[PDB]
Amino acid sequence: NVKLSEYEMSIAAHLVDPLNMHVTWSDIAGLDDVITDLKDTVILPIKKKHLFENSRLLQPPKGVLLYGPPGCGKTLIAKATAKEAGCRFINLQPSTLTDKWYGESQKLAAAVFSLAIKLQPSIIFIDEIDSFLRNRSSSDHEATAMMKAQFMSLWDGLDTDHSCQVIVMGATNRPQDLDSAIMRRMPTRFHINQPALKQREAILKLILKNENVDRHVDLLEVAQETDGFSGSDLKEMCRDAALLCVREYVNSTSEESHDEDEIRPVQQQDLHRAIEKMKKSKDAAFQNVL
Amino acid sequence: NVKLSEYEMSIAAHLVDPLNMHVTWSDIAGLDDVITDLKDTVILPIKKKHLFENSRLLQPPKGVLLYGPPGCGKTLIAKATAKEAGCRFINLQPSTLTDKWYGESQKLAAAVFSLAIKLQPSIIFIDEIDSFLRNRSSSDHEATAMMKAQFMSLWDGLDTDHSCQVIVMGATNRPQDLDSAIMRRMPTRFHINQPALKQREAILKLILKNENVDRHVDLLEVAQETDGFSGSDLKEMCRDAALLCVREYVNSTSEESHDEDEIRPVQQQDLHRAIEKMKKSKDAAFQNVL
Amino acid sequence: NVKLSEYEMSIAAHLVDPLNMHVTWSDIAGLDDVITDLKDTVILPIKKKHLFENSRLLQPPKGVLLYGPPGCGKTLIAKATAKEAGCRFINLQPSTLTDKWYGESQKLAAAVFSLAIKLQPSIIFIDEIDSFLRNRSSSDHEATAMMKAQFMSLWDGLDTDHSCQVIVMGATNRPQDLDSAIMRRMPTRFHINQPALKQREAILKLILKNENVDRHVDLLEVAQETDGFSGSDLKEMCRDAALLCVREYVNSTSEESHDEDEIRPVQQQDLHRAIEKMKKSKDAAFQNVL
Amino acid sequence: NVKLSEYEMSIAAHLVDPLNMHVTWSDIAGLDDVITDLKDTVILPIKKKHLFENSRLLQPPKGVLLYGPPGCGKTLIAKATAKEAGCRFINLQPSTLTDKWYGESQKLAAAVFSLAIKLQPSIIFIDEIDSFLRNRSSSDHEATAMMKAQFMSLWDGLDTDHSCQVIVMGATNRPQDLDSAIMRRMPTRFHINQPALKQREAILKLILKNENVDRHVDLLEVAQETDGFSGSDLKEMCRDAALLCVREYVNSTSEESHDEDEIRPVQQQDLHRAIEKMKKSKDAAFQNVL
Amino acid sequence: NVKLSEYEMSIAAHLVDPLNMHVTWSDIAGLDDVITDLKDTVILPIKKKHLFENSRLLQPPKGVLLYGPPGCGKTLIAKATAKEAGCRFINLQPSTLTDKWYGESQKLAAAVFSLAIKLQPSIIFIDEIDSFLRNRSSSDHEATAMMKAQFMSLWDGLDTDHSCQVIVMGATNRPQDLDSAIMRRMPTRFHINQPALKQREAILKLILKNENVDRHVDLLEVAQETDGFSGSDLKEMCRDAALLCVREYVNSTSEESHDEDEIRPVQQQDLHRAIEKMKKSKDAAFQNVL
Amino acid sequence: NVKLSEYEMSIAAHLVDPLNMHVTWSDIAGLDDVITDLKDTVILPIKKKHLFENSRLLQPPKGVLLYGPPGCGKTLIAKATAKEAGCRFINLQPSTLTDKWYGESQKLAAAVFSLAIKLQPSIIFIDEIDSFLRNRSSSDHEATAMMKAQFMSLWDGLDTDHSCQVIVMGATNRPQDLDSAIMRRMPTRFHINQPALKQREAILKLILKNENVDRHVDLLEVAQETDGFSGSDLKEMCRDAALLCVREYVNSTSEESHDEDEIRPVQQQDLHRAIEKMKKSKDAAFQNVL
Ligand SMILES: Nc1ncnc2c1ncn2[C@@H]1O[C@H](COP(=O)(O)OP(=O)(O)OP(O)(O)=S)[C@@H](O)[C@H]1O
Ligand SMILES: Nc1ncnc2c1ncn2[C@@H]1O[C@H](COP(=O)(O)OP(=O)(O)OP(O)(O)=S)[C@@H](O)[C@H]1O
Ligand SMILES: Nc1ncnc2c1ncn2[C@@H]1O[C@H](COP(=O)(O)OP(=O)(O)OP(O)(O)=S)[C@@H](O)[C@H]1O
Ligand SMILES: Nc1ncnc2c1ncn2[C@@H]1O[C@H](COP(=O)(O)OP(=O)(O)OP(O)(O)=S)[C@@H](O)[C@H]1O
Ligand SMILES: Nc1ncnc2c1ncn2[C@@H]1O[C@H](COP(=O)(O)OP(=O)(O)OP(O)(O)=S)[C@@H](O)[C@H]1O
Ligand SMILES: Nc1ncnc2c1ncn2[C@@H]1O[C@H](COP(=O)(O)OP(=O)(O)OP(O)(O)=S)[C@@H](O)[C@H]1O
C-alpha cells in the first residue's frame, strides 16, 4: 500500500519477508541473557510503542551495534530479532550504496531512509558495517565522502524527530576499525560473547535436541573438549560426528549386511572421535600458520 | 505414468535415460576424495531418504555447485553422479529458458520445476550456469528479469517445502562471474581440482588400463612431464601416442612387410615423444599468445 | 575504392549507408545538453581533424561509452551521431565475432579494425557491449580468451598511432556488468539520462510536432502524469492515444454516419485516457511482479 | 489495365481473385482481439490511406509476421485479411523464386515487387517464410545469395519510398528458424495463439452454428475435454462426431427401417464419444512416439 | 547375398559401386594433412577392425563431418574415401527421406540403417546435411518431427552396440545452420580448408600433371594470382586457358595454314591471360553485387 | 626467458611494458624537488646497483610510500618512475589477491614475490594500498588474515636477503587508514604536495607548453585564481578554456563565415572565464555540501 519512487521500489526489493524466515527465539541458546536484554530494550518499544512514550527516555535506541568474534551467532540473532520483532527488516548490504557510476547514489541513500520512515516501525541492518563506507576508487572517493555526509545527516534526522519509530542496527567481526563517527553513534551496544562452559553445554543441547541420540551421552566432557571452538565450529563438529556415523554405516552395509535400514545412534565415542578430528583440522590450520 | 502439460512434455524430452548413459564410479579417477564427499552427501539421502529425516539437517543440500578449471572432469562427474544416483536427471541447457518470442517462457520455467517436483527424487543440472541468466536483447531484457525472479522464487519454494526431494546442480569454468544471488544460494560447493602428481598417475593408470601396454612402462616420469596438462589434455596425450604408434605401424607395413597384423605395444619412448609433441602444440598456442 | 580481403568484404557488408539512414539532429529532443557535448567532442575532430591537431590533447577520445536505462534513446543517438558525423559507421553486433567453429575468427577480429583503419575517419559501435565478450561453450572458451586478447591489443594499437582517426563506441543497459578491462578503457562517458519534467515536455512536443493536434492541449499535466515512463514508453503512450481515437472514429463511422472522412483531433482527454490505460498496463506488469 | 513484362504476367497469374475467395470476418472466431488489432493496423491505412498520412507514423507497417502453432488458423486469417482488405493479394509460394536453371530468377524477383508497386494498394504474403530463402544445391547456392540480397534490397526500397502503399506478410510454424535479417525486419508481429477455454467455446459455437444441433448440448464440458486440441483438431473432432452419427444412421436404416430419411441430431453423447476417439488417435500418435 | 525388404531393395539401389568410381588418393592434392588424418582415423579401423578393438577407444568415430567453403573439394574427398575405404557407401540424398505422402517414410528411415547394419563395414553419407531434416509443408511437419526422432534414435542405436561397424558422414557449405542435435553428435570434424600458396601450387601441379605443358612454366606467380580463387575455380581457370589456346589454334588453322595438326603448348602467357579473364568474370559478379 | 608456473604466468600478464608507457621526466612539473629525491634514492641503486653496495646502507629502501591529496599526480609519478627506472614494474591492483573461492590465493601471493624475485631489478606497486588487505566477507576473513601474514612474511624475506634487488611501492589518498603494520614498514616516504604559487605556474607552463597560446598571456594571475584547485583540476580548467574557445569558434563559423579554418588563440580572457566557470562548478559542489 506504500507509494514508491524507482529508488524506493529498489529498496523494497531488499526488504525481507516475515513469512519465509525460519529462526525464532526457540532456536537460539547460549546467549539468553543478551537475548533478554535485546528483547526488552528493542522489541518492547517496537511492538507497543505508545506504552513507552510517557518518558523522555527508554525510547528505542537510535542505534544498536552487535560486536563479537566470528561464528558467535551475530547473523543468527540479527535474523531472529528481525522475525520476532514482527516489524519490517531491511538488509542493507554494501553494494546497495557503492554505486560506482550513477549520481543515482544520492537519491538512493535518501530512499533507504525514506522507505524506512514510511514503514513504521522498521529496523535497518548493516552486516560488516565496518566496510559500509570504505570502498574507494578513482570514481568513488568524492562520492564516498558525499555518501558519508548524507548517511550521518539522515541519521541525525532520525534523531531529530521525536516521533521517529525506526532503528538502525549493525554487526561486525573486527569492530575496532569502525570510524569514530560510528563510535560516537550507536549508543546501546550488545556483546555477542563466545559460549562459556555452561553456555557451550546449552549450545550442544540445542543442536542435539532433534538429532538421534542415545540418552547415556555425557556432554560436559564434550563441553570441555569443545572449549577451544566457536559456535559455528560447534555446529560443524556435530556435523563431522553425524557424517562419520553415516560413513561407517554405509561401509558396514555394503558387505552383504541385511537391509534393516537402521543406523547406530549418536554415542559418546562418536563425538570424541569427531572432536579429535576437528582439533586435527585446527592443527592443520595452525601448522599452516607455523 | 506422470501426467504432463505441453510444457512438461517438452521438459520430459530433455530428461536423460539411465539405460543409455555409460560412465560409472568404476570409470573415474584422480578425484576419489571429492568423489567420496559427493557420494556421501548427495547420493545417500537421495536413495534412501527416509533414513536421514530424523534430523533437521544433513537433509540433501538445496544446491550443489561444481567449480574447477576446464578439462578437470566436471561434465564427466555430472554424468557419473546422474547415472549412479539412480534418480532422474534433467540437463537444463540455456536454450530451454531463453525463449525469445513466446510468453510461453513463464510457464516453461514453471514446468521445469513442476516436472522435477513430480519426479521425486530427481536432480536438476545447469552446465555453464554463469551464462544461465545473462543473454540479452531488445526482446529479452524484461523477460530476462522475469525469468530471474521466477527461478529464484521457485528455488525458494523448493527450500520452503520440508518434504522436498529434488536437488539442483551446476557447473562452470569461470565461476567468479556468477551472480551474487547464486553465490548466496548453492550452499555446498565441491572443487574439481586439477590432478596432482599422484592423481595424475592415477589418471594415466585409468586411461591405460585397457590399452595395449608393455609392463615395463614407468609412469611417474610421465606424471612429471604431464604436470602442465589438464585431464582432458592427458587423455589427448595418450591419444597422440596411440595414433603415433598406428602411423609408424602402417608406414612399416606398406613396404612389403608380412601380413602378421600385430602392432608395437605402448612403450615409454612412445609416450615420451607424444608428450614432447603435445608440449609443442602448447608451445604453438603460446607463440600465438606471444 | 578500398582493397579488401574476404574478411574485409565480410565487414564491408555490415557497414551502414549514410543515404538510407533517417534520424538527424532535427529528430532528437530531451538530451540537447548531452547532444551538445557529444557533438562538440566527437564530431568536430572527426570532420575537420587537422584543425585540432595542434594540441597533445582534445584529440578525439579513444573510446566513447553511452550508458542509460532502457528506452532512453541510446540506439537513436547512436544512429543520429553516425549519420550526422558524415563518416563511416560499422555496427558490430556480437555474432560478428562469436565464430563457433572457424579459426577464421582471429583474422576476422583483425579485419574489423583493418577496415576501420583503412576507412579514415570511421566509428565502430557495439550495442549490448556487455555481452560482447561473454558467450561461452565447449568450443568457445579458449577462443573467447583469444578474442579478448586480440581486441584489447588492437585497441592499444589504435591508441599507439598518433595519426589514428577512428573511434570506438558502445552502448549498454546494465553497464555495471562491464569487464574491468572495458572500465579502464573508454575514457569519455556520456549519460543518456531519463527525461526530466522539462525534458519530458520537450519529448512530447517533438512527438506531437507533426501529429494532428488541437492547439488547446496542455502538456505539462501530461508531463507530470508521464513522469513514471521512459522515452520509448512516452512514444508508445502517444501511440495508444492515437489508436484510441482511430478506434472511436471507426466505431462511430459504421453506424450510418456520413462519409466525410475526418477524425477528431488530438485533445487533452484523449491523452488522459491513454495515459491511464498505459499506467494500467504498467499495473498489470506490477501485479505479475507481485 | 496494367502493363506487364513476361515476368509480371507470370506474377499476375499467382494473384488471387477477390470474387472466388470465401472466408470473411463473419467466419472467424477465437482470435477477435488479434482480429481487431490486425484490422485496425493493417486494413484501415490500406483502404483510405490519405486519412492516415498526416503523421510520420501509423503508416502501414513495412512488415507483418504471423506466428503461432500449426492448426491455429494462420492461413485462414491470411485469406480473411486478403479478402476483407479489398486490395490485391499475391501468394508467393517458394517455387516462385527457387528457379534452379534460369538467370530469369533475378528479373523474376524484381518483377514480384514491380507488380506489387504497380498495384497500389496490395499485400505480399509468404507462407512457410522460414523456408523462403533456404533451398540449396550445386546450382543454387550462389543464386540463393543473390536472391537474398535482391529481396532485402527491394524491401529497403519499399521502406525508402514514403509514398509506398504495399505491405509484405508472412506466416510460419517454427519461426525461431527465421534468419536474423528477417528478425530485424517485420516490425509488427501478431501472435496467433491457441484458443483458451472461452476461445475454444467460441470456436465450437462457430463450427456448430450451422450444423444440426439439439439445443440441450452443453459445450463448456466439451471445451475442457478439447483443451488438448488445436483449432484444426477441433474442426476434425466435430468431423468425427458428425460422421459417427451418419454411420449409426446408415447401419440402422439398412435393417428394414422405414424410409423417413431423418437423422439423429447432434447430442452431447455424440461429441463425448467423438472426443474420446480423437484422444485415442492422439494416443496412437503418442505410442508411436513412445 | 543380402536378404532385403522392398525398403532395403530401394536403399540397395542408391548404393554406389566400387568398380565404377574413378577418383583415388592419387587424384587429390592440397589437403594431404587432412587426407592423412581422415585415412588414419576412418579407413584403418574400417579395413582391419579387429586390430583396433583392444581399446575402449580409437574405435571408428560414430560421426564424421566435413566442413569447408564451396569448391574446396568436399564431394571429391567423400568419393575418394568411399572408393579407397573399399567398404560399401550409401549416398543418402534428401529426397530419400522427404516422402511427402506415404507412411512408408518410417519404415524407409528404418531400412536405411537396417541395410547399413547388414552391410558391415559400410559408410553413410549425407551431402547438404543442413537441409537433411528441414523441408516443411502442410503434409510434412509432423512427419518431419517423426523423421527427426527416428534418425537420432537409430543413431543412438548405432552408438549403443559396441560391435557396430558402420559410420555416418556428412558435408555442408553453411554448417552453422546445423541443428544443435547434429552439433552434439558428429564428434570428429575435419576442416576442408582452402588451398594456401603452397597448397595452391600443389593443386596446379595436380591439374597440369597430364596436360600438354612447356617445362618453362612458372607456377608460383600463378599461385599468387590465383590466391583469390577456390579449387573448383582453379580447375575452371585451367579450363579457360586450355580453351583459349584451342580457340587461337582453330582461328589460325582456317587461314590456309598447313594441316600439321599440332597445338601451341601451355605457356605462362596463356595462364596469365586466362587468369585475367577469370578475374574479369569475378569482377562481373562483383559489379552485379555492387 | 623466465620459467613460470601458472601463478607466475598470471602475474606476468599484469607486468607493464616499457615500450607502451608514455610519460617521462620531461612530462612532469611542480614536484621537481621530490622528483630529484625519488630519482636519486630509488633509480640510482636500481640501474647500477653494484655501485652502491660498498655500504651497509643507501641500499635501495625496502619500501617507498607516496602520500598526497587526490589529483596531486601520484599515479603520474608512479608511471614516470616505472618507465624512467627502466626496470620491470608490476601493477598489483587489489583484485589480484582477493581471490574469494580458490585456495589458489596462497600460491598466488607467493607467486607475486616469486616473479618479482626472478626479475631483478623490479618494482612492485600497490595503488590504493589502504584497501589492499581490508576486503571482508563470510568466505574471506580467515583468508584475509592468511593473506596478511603471508605478505608481511614475504616482505620480511625481501628484507632478509642482503642480495635482494626488488622494491615495493604504494600510493593512497587517505593514508591515515593504513594498518600499523604498514606504518612500521615503508621507511622512506615522499609527500606529493599540492602545487604552490610558483609550482602552480610551472604546472600551467607544462600544460600550455604545446597548446596554441598568444605570447601576451599572463599566468601568475591565473596562478592566484587557480590556487584553490588541484593539479587534475588545473588540467581540467585548461580543458574548459580550450573547449570554450572551440564552442565560440563553431558558433561563429556557422553564420555564413568564410571557410578559413583558423581559431582564436588562447588569451587571458579565455582562462579568466574558464576559471570562473570552474569555480562555479566547485560552488555547485559546495551548495550540494551546504
Ligand atoms: N548461540 C547459538 N545458537 C545457535 N546457533 C548458533 C549460535 N552461535 C552460533 N550459531 C551458528 O552459527 C551460524 C553462523 O554463524 P554466525 O555467527 O551467525 O555468523 P557470523 O556472525 O556472521 O560470522 P561471520 O564471520 O560474520 S560470516 C549458524 O549456522 C548458527 O546455527
Ligand atoms: N579425473 C578424470 N577421470 C577420467 N576422465 C577425466 C578426468 N578428468 C577429465 N577427464 C576427461 O575429460 C573429458 C572432458 O572434460 P570435462 O572436464 O569433463 O568437461 P568440462 O569440465 O565441461 O570442460 P569444459 O571446458 O566445461 S567443456 C572426458 O573425456 C574425461 O574422460
Ligand atoms: N530523447 C528522445 N528523442 C526521441 N526519441 C526518443 C528519445 N528517447 C527515446 N526515444 C525513442 O526510443 C526508441 C527506442 O529506444 P532506445 O532507447 O533508442 O533503444 P535502446 O536504448 O536500445 O533500448 P534497449 O533496451 O537497449 S533495445 C525510438 O523509437 C525513439 O524514438
Ligand atoms: N479460430 C479459428 N476459426 C476458424 N477456423 C479455424 C480457426 N483456427 C483454426 N481453424 C481451422 O484451421 C484450418 C487450417 O488450419 P490453419 O491453422 O489455418 O492452417 P496453418 O496455420 O497453415 O497450419 P499449417 O501447419 O501451417 S498447414 C481451417 O480449416 C480453419 O477452419
Ligand atoms: N584439392 C583438390 N584436389 C583436386 N580437385 C579438387 C580439389 N579441390 C577442389 N577440387 C575440384 O573441385 C570439384 C568440385 O568441387 P567440390 O568442392 O568437390 O564440390 P562441393 O564441395 O560439393 O561444392 P558444393 O558447393 O557443395 S556443390 C572437382 O571437380 C575437383 O576436381
Ligand atoms: N605535477 C603534475 N604534472 C603533470 N600532471 C599532473 C601533475 N599533478 C597532477 N597531474 C595530472 O593529474 C592526473 C591524474 O591525477 P593523479 O594525481 O596522477 O591521480 P591520483 O593521484 O591517483 O588521484 P586519485 O584520487 O588517487 S585517482 C594526470 O592527468 C596528470 O596530468
Q: Got the DSSP string for chain D?
A: -----HHHHHHHHHB--TTT----GGG--S-HHHHHHHIIIIIHHHHTGGGG-SSSSSSPPS-EEEE--TTSSHHHHHHHHHHHH-SEEEE--GGGT--SS-THHHHHHHHHHHHHHHSSSEEEEETTGGGTTT---TTTHHHHHHHHHHHHHHHHHHHH-TT---EEEEEESSGGGS-HHHHHS--EEEE-PPP-HHHHHHHHHHHHTTS-B-TT---HHHHHHTTTS-HHHHHHHHHHHHHHHHHHHHHHHHTT-------PPB-HHHHHHHHHHHHHHHHHHHHHH-
Q: Is A1 inside a domain boundary?
A: no
**Contact: chain F with chain E (3+ CB pairs below 8 Å):** no
Residues B206 and B182 in one domain: no
Q: Tell me, what amino acid is at A201?
A: E
Residues D20 and D158 in one domain: yes
Q: Is B135's CB within 8 Å of C130's CB?
A: no
C-alpha cell at E243: 580453351
**In 3D, which of A17, E149, C138 has the Cα closest to residue B76?**
C138
Residues F170 and F220 in one domain: no
Q: Is D138 inside a domain boundary?
A: yes
Q: Is A289's CB within 8 Å of F149's CB?
A: yes
A70 in ligand 1 pocket by Cβ < 6 Å? yes
Residues B158 and B257 in one domain: no
C-alpha cell at A30: 547460549
List the CATH number of the domain containing A239.
1.10.8.60
Residues F99 and F184 in one domain: yes
**In 3D, which of B250, B249, B240, B248 has the Cα closest to residue B271?**
B240
Residues B184 and B209 in one domain: no
Report CA(B73)–ligand 2 centroid distance (Å): 3
B256 burial class (0-12, 13-18, 19+ CB within 10 angstroms)? exposed
C-alpha cell at B137: 536483447
**Contact: chain B with chain A (3+ CB pairs below 8 Å):** yes
Q: Identify the three-state secondary structure at position F179.
A: coil
Is the separation of the CB atoms in B187 and B170 below 8 Å?
no
Q: How far apart are CA C250 and CA C260, in angstroms?
A: 12
Report CA(F280)–ligand 6 centroid distance (Å): 22
Q: How far apart are CA B206 and CA B201, in angstroms?
A: 9
Report CA(D59)–ligand 6 centroid distance (Å): 56
Q: Identify the three-state secondary structure at position A240.
A: helix
Q: Is B152 inside a domain boundary?
A: yes
Quick one: closest CA in C to E286, which residue?
C9
DSSP assignment letter at A183: H
The CB-side HSE value for D233 (13 A sphere, CA atoms) comes to 21
C-alpha cell at E181: 542435435
Domain C-terminal end among E126, E158, E191 = E191
Distance of residue D26 Cα from the nearest chain B Cα, in angstroms: 28
Q: How far apart are CA E232 and CA B130, in angstroms?
A: 45
Q: Is E175's CB within 8 Å of C101's CB?
A: yes
Q: How far apart are CA F201 and CA F221, in angstroms?
A: 9
C-alpha cell at A163: 516521533
Q: Which residues on chain C place their C-beta less than 8 Å from a C-beta of chain A? A: 67, 175-176, 189, 191
Q: Chain B residues with CB inside 8 Å of C110's CB?
A: none
Residues linked to residue F8 through DSSP beta bridges, in sequence order: none
Quick one: closest CA in C to D55, which residue?
C211
Total domains in the fold of chain A: 2
**In 3D, which of E37, F132, D200, E60 has the Cα closest to residue A134?**
F132
Residues A243 and A270 in one domain: yes
Find the Cα–Cα–Cα–Cα dihedral B153, B158, B161, B162, rounded to 10°. -140
**In 3D, which of E246, E250, E248, E226 has the Cα closest to residue E236?**
E226
Report CA(C288)–ligand 3 centroid distance (Å): 25
How many pairs of residues across B and F have Cβ atoms under 8 Å apart? 6
Residues having CB closer than 6 A to ligand 2 are B 28-31, 70-76, 173, 203, 206, 231-232, 235; C 138, 141
Is the separation of the CB atoms in C83 and C10 below 8 Å?
no
C-alpha cell at C170: 558502445
Residues linked to residue E183 through DSSP beta bridges, in sequence order: none
Q: Is B1 inside a domain boundary?
A: no
Is the separation of the CB atoms in D148 and D156 below 8 Å?
no
Quick one: closest CA in D to C208, which residue?
D55
Q: Is A173's CB within 8 Å of F289's CB?
A: no
Report CA(E76)–ligand 5 centroid distance (Å): 5
φ and ψ at residue E10, rounded to 5 degrees? -60, -45
Which atom of ligand 1 is the closest one to the Cα of A199?
Answer: 1
**Contact: chain E with chain D (3+ CB pairs below 8 Å):** yes
Best D72, D126, D134 residue to mutate vs chain E (most E CBs within 10 Å) = D134
Residues B101 and B185 in one domain: yes
Is the separation of the CB atoms in B116 and B15 below 8 Å?
no
Planar angle of CA A215, A216, A221, nearest 5 degrees:
120
Residues linked to residue F90 through DSSP beta bridges, in sequence order: F15, F124
Residue A70 labelled as part of a binding site: yes
DSSP assignment letter at F231: H
Q: Which residues on chain D place their C-beta less than 8 Å from a C-beta of chain B? A: 67, 175-176, 189, 191
Q: How far apart are CA B63 and CA A44, in angstroms?
A: 38
Who among F20, F211, F261 is closest to C160 (CB)? F20
Q: Tell me, what amino acid is at A290?
A: L
Report CA(E137)–ligand 2 centroid distance (Å): 42
Residues linked to residue D115 through DSSP beta bridges, in sequence order: none
Residues A41 and A154 in one domain: yes
Q: Is E173's CB within 8 Å of D136's CB?
A: yes
Distance of residue D289 Cα from the nearest chain E Cα, in angstroms: 8
Best F207, F246, F254 residue to mutate vs chain C (most C CBs within 10 Å) = F246
Domain enclosing residue F222, as ranges: 197-289
Q: Is D1 inside a domain boundary?
A: no
Q: Chain F residues with CB inside 8 Å of B191's CB?
A: 102
Cell 586480440 -> residue: C150
Planar angle of CA C29, C33, C37, nearest 5 degrees:
120
Residues having CB closer than 6 A to ligand 5 are D 138, 141; E 28-31, 70-76, 173, 203, 206, 231-232, 235
Is the separation of the CB atoms in B77 and B28 below 8 Å?
yes
Q: Which residues on chain A place their C-beta less than 8 Å from a C-beta of chain C? A: 100-102
Quick one: closest CA in B to C153, which residue?
B289
Q: How far apart are CA C280 and CA B23, in angstroms?
A: 55
List the CATH number of the domain containing E161.
3.40.50.300
Residues linked to residue B171 through DSSP beta bridges, in sequence order: B66
Q: Chain F residues with CB inside 8 Å of C180's CB?
A: 95
How many other C-beta atoms are found inside a 10 Å radius of the C-beta of residue B261?
A: 10
A203 in ligand 1 pocket by Cβ < 6 Å? yes
Q: Is E129 inside a domain boundary?
A: yes
Nearest bound ligand to CA F238? Answer: 6
Residues C170 and C269 in one domain: no
Domain C-terminal end among B191, B218, B236 = B191
Domain C-terminal end among B148, B170, B191 = B191
Residue D75 labelled as part of a binding site: yes
C31 in ligand 3 pocket by Cβ < 6 Å? yes
Q: Is C1 inside a domain boundary?
A: no
Residue E74 labelled as part of a binding site: yes
Find the Cα–Cα–Cα–Cα dihedral A97, A103, A108, A114, rounded to 10°. 140
Nearest bound ligand to CA A174? Answer: 1
Cell 511492538 -> residue: A47
Sign of CA dihedral E226, E232, E233, E234: positive
Q: Chain E residues with CB inside 8 Å of C100's CB?
A: 176
Q: Chain B residues with CB inside 8 Å of C107's CB?
A: none
Distance of residue B199 Cα from the nearest chain D Cα, in angstroms: 44
Residues C144 and C87 in one domain: yes
Residues C151 and C22 in one domain: yes
Find the Cα–Cα–Cα–Cα dihedral C32, C33, C34, C37, rounded to 10°. 120
The pairing of strands C122-126 and C88-91 is parallel
Residues linked to residue F189 through DSSP beta bridges, in sequence order: F65
**In 3D, which of C31, C74, C80, C89 has the Cα closest to residue C171?**
C74
Residue C157 labelled as part of a binding site: no
Q: Is E1 inside a domain boundary?
A: no
φ and ψ at residue F97, rounded to 5 degrees? -110, -25
Q: How far apart are CA A234 and CA A204, in angstroms?
A: 7
